[PDB]
Amino acid sequence: MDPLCAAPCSCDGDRRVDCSGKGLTAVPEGLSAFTQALDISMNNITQLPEGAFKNFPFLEELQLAGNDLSFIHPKALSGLKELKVLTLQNNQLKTVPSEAIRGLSALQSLRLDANHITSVPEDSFEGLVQLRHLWLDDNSLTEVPVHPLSNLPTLQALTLALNKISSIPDFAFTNLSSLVVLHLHNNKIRSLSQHCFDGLDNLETLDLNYNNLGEFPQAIKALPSLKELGFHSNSISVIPDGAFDGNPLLRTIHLYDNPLSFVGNSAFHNLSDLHSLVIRGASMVQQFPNLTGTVHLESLTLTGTKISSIPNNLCQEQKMLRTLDLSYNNIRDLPSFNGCHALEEISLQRNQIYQIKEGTFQGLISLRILDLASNQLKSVPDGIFDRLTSLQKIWLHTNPWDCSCPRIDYLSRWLNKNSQKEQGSAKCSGSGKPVRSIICPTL
């Protein structure tokens, strides 16, 4: 028995009390009023009466998750003027308890997720002059609670994810000037009004994944601080030129699981902080994306297009490239790769490459993986693989290799000496013999 505590709870030396999972039906008695954190989650507190926390006026953290809480008296949380964190997720609240939280003027974090909230009273959040994080995810909201959110200029993170929001009107978040993170994933958003995000000048993260967007949202043009954008698993068919004109600081764009058939040639131009670009199955794309000003790209994947040409300045403009996958397009001519000193992984399988020019592989000192399978290569220049000191694995098979001597001399001898590196077998057109097995006559 702890004299400075109270059974069945547990107390530490820093005024933190753990009374979680003890079958409690009420707020514990016998504890110090100077208690700073109270964890009473995972109990059986189905209701909080008037004066519930009368003995905890100095409380800073309160965890009430995983009870089956369905009612909070308007006066249950009276006196909690030091409360910074309130945790209410995984309960049976049907409405936002606006009355009960009105006097919580020090509150910085409010978790209301995983309840069954269908409505937000128009006066919700009015007293929360310090709120920084608001979780309203995993409920049954059918709209953005516009007027309640107008009360929170200090808010930095908001989630309205896993609800049933179908549209967002003009100026829905306009008072949220401190907002940095906005989650709207797993709703049914089909309509974003032209000015729905106006006022969110500090927003760095927007998550629109798993929605029902068709037209690409022009509304994101009002997001100058945007660094991370997710709109994967929607119904977007085209990413137009100018799409990211308002977002020069974008580092991350998740755009997969969309029926993307076309992307504008300049859609990803002038994005100096963009780290990676992965676009697959945009079948109507014919020209290589204009990436002028997009100089910090470390990874690029472009597959399933009609692209037949790669710009010669690729390894100049995109010098930081570590990973390059341009497989399953229609490429015939390759650029020089000399400027790509950081390139570790290259995939060019299933194109129409018929030649490599001499001395275009000399700068590839970091190259570990080289995939040239399923092309139209009959030959390579002598000493093409000379400078590939980091090379681990190479694919050369499914090419019509001309095994005439002395044309095949270098490659046959290279593949023999470097047999551990070759994956599958480059074979001679006609005879079907492995290229490594050919010994050309010598002087």
Ligand X SMILES: *[C@@H]1O[C@H](CO)[C@@H](O)[C@H](O)[C@H]1NC(C)=O
Tokens (6 digits) for 292: 């002028």
Q: Of 159, 318, 323, 329, which one interacts with Cl ion (CB under 5 A)?
A: 323
Specify the DSSP class assigned to residue 270. T
CA distances 12 to 5, 208, 292, 339, Å, are 9, 42, 58, 59
Write down the least CB distance from residue 345 to Cl ion, Å.
8
19-26 long-range Cβ contacts below 8 angstroms, 24+ apart: 19/43, 20/63, 26/52
432 binds, among ligand X, Cl ion, none (CB under 5 to 8 A by kind): none
Residue (17 or 93) nearer to Cl ion, CB: 93
In this complex, which beta carbon is closest to ligand X, that of residue 3 or of residue 23? 23
Quote the CA–CA distance of 70 and 72 in Å, as a whole number.
7
In angstroms, give the least distance from the CB of 184 to ligand X: 20
Binding to ligand X in span 146-165, by CB under 6 A = 150
Three-state DSSP state, 221: helix
Q: How many residues bind ligand X (CB under 6 A)?
A: 9
Shortest Cβ contact with Cl ion: which residue? 299
By beta-carbon proximity to ligand X, the closer residue of 23 and 441 is 23
Binder among 108, 156, 270, 404 for ligand X (CB under 6 A): 270
| Residues in 159-198 at the binding interface with ligand X, rule: CB under 6 A | 174-175
Spell out the residues 6+ positions from residue 22 whose beta carbon is closer than 8 angstroms to its own.
8, 9, 43
Cβ atoms within 10 A of the Cβ of 331, count? 21
The verdict on 299 binding Cl ion (CB under 5 A) reads yes
How many CA within 13 A on the CB side of residue 325?
A: 12
Q: How far is the CB of 116 from Cl ion (least distance, A)?
A: 7
- When asked if residue 25 is in the footprint of ligand X (CB under 6 A), the reply is yes
349 contacts Cl ion (rule: CB under 5 A)? no
Of ligand X, Cl ion, none, which one sits near residue 44, judging by CB under 5 to 8 A according to partner kind?
A: ligand X
CA distance 67 to 25: 9
Does position 70 interact with ligand X (CB under 6 A)? The reply is no
Beta bridge partners of residue 427, listed in sequence order: 434
Query: Can you give the binding site for ligand X, defined by CB under 6 A?
Result: 23, 25, 44, 46, 150, 174-175, 270, 293
Query: Can you give the binding site for Cl ion, defined by CB under 5 A?
Result: 299, 323
